[PDB]
Amino acid sequence: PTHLSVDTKFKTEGLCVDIPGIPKDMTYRRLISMMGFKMNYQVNGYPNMFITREEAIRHVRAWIGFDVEGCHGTNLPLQLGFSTGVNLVAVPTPLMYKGLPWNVVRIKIVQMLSDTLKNLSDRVVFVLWAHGFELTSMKYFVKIGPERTCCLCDRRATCFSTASDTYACWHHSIGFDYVYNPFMIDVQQWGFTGNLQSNHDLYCQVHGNAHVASCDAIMTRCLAVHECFVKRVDWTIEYPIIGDELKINAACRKVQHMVVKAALLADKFPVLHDIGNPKAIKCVPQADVEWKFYDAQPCSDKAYKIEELFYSYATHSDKFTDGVCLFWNCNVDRYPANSIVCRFDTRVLSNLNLPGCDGGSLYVNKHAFHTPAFDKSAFVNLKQLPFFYYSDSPCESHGIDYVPLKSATCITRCNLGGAVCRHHANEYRLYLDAYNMMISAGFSLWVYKQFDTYNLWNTFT
Numbered sequence: 495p496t497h498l499s500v501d502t503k504f505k506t507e508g509l510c511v512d513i514p515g516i517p518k519d520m521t522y523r524r525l526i527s528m529m530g531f532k533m534n535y536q537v538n539g540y541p542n543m544f545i546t547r548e549e550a551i552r553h554v555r556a557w558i559g560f561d562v563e564g565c566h567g568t569n570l571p572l573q574l575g576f577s578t579g580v581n582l583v584a585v586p587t588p589l590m591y592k593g594l595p596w597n598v599v600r601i602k603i604v605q606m607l608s609d610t611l612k613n614l615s616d617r618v619v620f621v622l623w624a625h626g627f628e629l630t631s632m633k634y635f636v637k638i639g640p641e642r643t644c645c646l647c648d649r650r651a652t653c654f655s656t657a658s659d660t661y662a663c664w665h666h667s668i669g670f671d672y673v674y675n676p677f678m679i680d681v682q683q684w685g686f687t688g689n690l691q692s693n694h695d696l697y698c699q700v701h702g703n704a705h706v707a708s709c710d711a712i713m714t715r716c717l718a719v720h721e722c723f724v725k726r727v728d729w730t731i732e733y734p735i736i737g738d739e740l741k742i743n744a745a746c747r748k749v750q751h752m753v754v755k756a757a758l759l760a761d762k763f764p765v766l767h768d769i770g771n772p773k774a775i776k777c778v779p780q781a782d783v784e785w786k787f788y789d790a791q792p793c794s795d796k797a798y799k800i801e802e803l804f805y806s807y808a809t810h811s812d813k814f815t816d817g818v819c820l821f822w823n824c825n826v827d828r829y830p831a832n833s834i835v836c837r838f839d840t841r842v843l844s845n846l847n848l849p850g851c852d853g854g855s856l857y858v859n860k861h862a863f864h865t866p867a868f869d870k871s872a873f874v875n876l877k878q879l880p881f882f883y884y885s886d887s888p889c890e891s892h893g894i895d896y897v898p899l900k901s902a903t904c905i906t907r908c909n910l911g912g913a914v915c916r917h918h919a920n921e922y923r924l925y926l927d928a929y930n931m932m933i934s935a936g937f938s939l940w941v942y943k944q945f946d947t948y949n950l951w952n953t954f955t
């Protein structure tokens with residue numbers, strides 16, 4: 495039960511307007527045959543062009559929505575739209591390109607997928623709401639065969655060139671003309687009522703429907719992300735390393751210990767309310783405070799209402815007003831004034847952050863986390879946390895060449911005393927680097943307005 499049997503049934507109702515007379519009884523095997531591909535009973539890593547929901551979900555980084563509209567069937571021109579916002583017109587003879595033959599259109603398809611996917615995935619998954627023309631158009635830009643490797647590296651082959659008769663991955667495909675061994679999934683097999691627009695629009699107000707093909711392609715991927723990562727969530731599925739995942743996760747642990755340690759030293763809160771991941775550990779384990787945990791899973795859909803987190807049914811809610819609240823990636827509509835907050839900025843551009851549903855983003859770093867749209871109004875009671883480095887650690891080298899550090903934000907005994915020691919300068923530069931890493935990954939840090947780093951200097955006396 496790993497791969498999708500070619501002898502599985504494919505519901506054909508969706509296809510019968512572009513393909514009138516299509517049999518109600520249809521297998522992937524006969525559909526793939528109809529699309530013009532020969533699978534020559536082959537056991538070489540590519541048993542099916544089509545894949546399971548489960549397989550699509552392991553490969554969410556490879557998803558490209560794809561839609562074709564009959565512009566006025568070998569007879570007529572076709573509008574090719576992709577979730578990248580690109581529209582190509584192919585003649586048989588927002589970005590919108592004039593009519594060209596398949597032999598140039600196919601080169602543009604390879605360039606576009608390569609530049610989109612080379613830092614994301616080892617493959618492409620075309621996400622369809624299939625009506626027929628997208629499926630019969632694939633023969634014009636796709637070739638299949640046994641799994642292969644790039645002619646320049648060890649990565650699996652995703653492209654093919656007729657000019658050179660060679661195979662490339664997404665990194666090495668410049669001037670290649672065919673997509674090689676693509677995958678695909680028809681969202682219309684998932685058992686929806688009514689059309690794409692009506693299903694999409696239930697969940698998402700951000701993607702309009704200008705009635706161009708890219709609009710449908712974007713909506714199709716959006717609906718699919720909603721179904722696989724918002725309504726349903728599976729946090730067991732791991733995802734490969736493709737960038738700075740480890741450095742970023744380490745940075746977030748370092749910034750969290752630093753900021754909460756400094757807050758406790760500066761304002762000496764008697765109680766900390768730690769709201770969010772039910773597996774969360776004390777980020778400052780030596781600190782004096784009453785540490786009280788509150789369980790909330792990552793909200794995939796809408797930010798939590800603070801009122802709902804405090805709603806206690808027939809018992810009294812704990813008083814939040816006492817001490818400080820820590821929301822470390824726990825996304826609520828409006829934070830209380832006495833909060834420390836880490837909140838992921840869905841708008842950030844990175845290889846980890848994929849476009850999501852209704853203005854949210856799918857952040858994929860070991861696990862996949864759909865995050866509700868970033869909203870500045872959530873922080874009305876807070877201010878941005880300023881950068882600072884704090885250490886009570888002794889001034890002591892042990893065992894990196896030097897320019898001496900001067901900074902107002904290096905809060906150590908040595909800087910109090912007039913000259914930063916080498917140990918604290920090394921630690922300061924490492925911590926500035928981790929902080930910059932975390933910010934540029936898309937985390938934003940907010941704090942109660944009374945927070946003042948001036949209060950930290952008298953913890954050395």
Ligand SMILES: Cc1ccc(NC(=O)c2cccc(F)c2)cc1O
Nearest residue numbers: 767788803804805806811812813814
């Ligand atoms: C900061 C903070 C977060 C959460 C709560 N919530 C409760 O105390 C509570 C008690 C019983 C059932 C329940 F669902 C919630 C209070 C807080 O002060």
Ligand SMILES: [Zn+2]
Nearest residue numbers: 644647663666
């Ligand atoms: Zn390669």
Ligand SMILES: [Zn+2]
Nearest residue numbers: 698701716852
């Ligand atoms: Zn949408």
Ligand SMILES: [Zn+2]
Nearest residue numbers: 889908915918
């Ligand atoms: Zn020092």
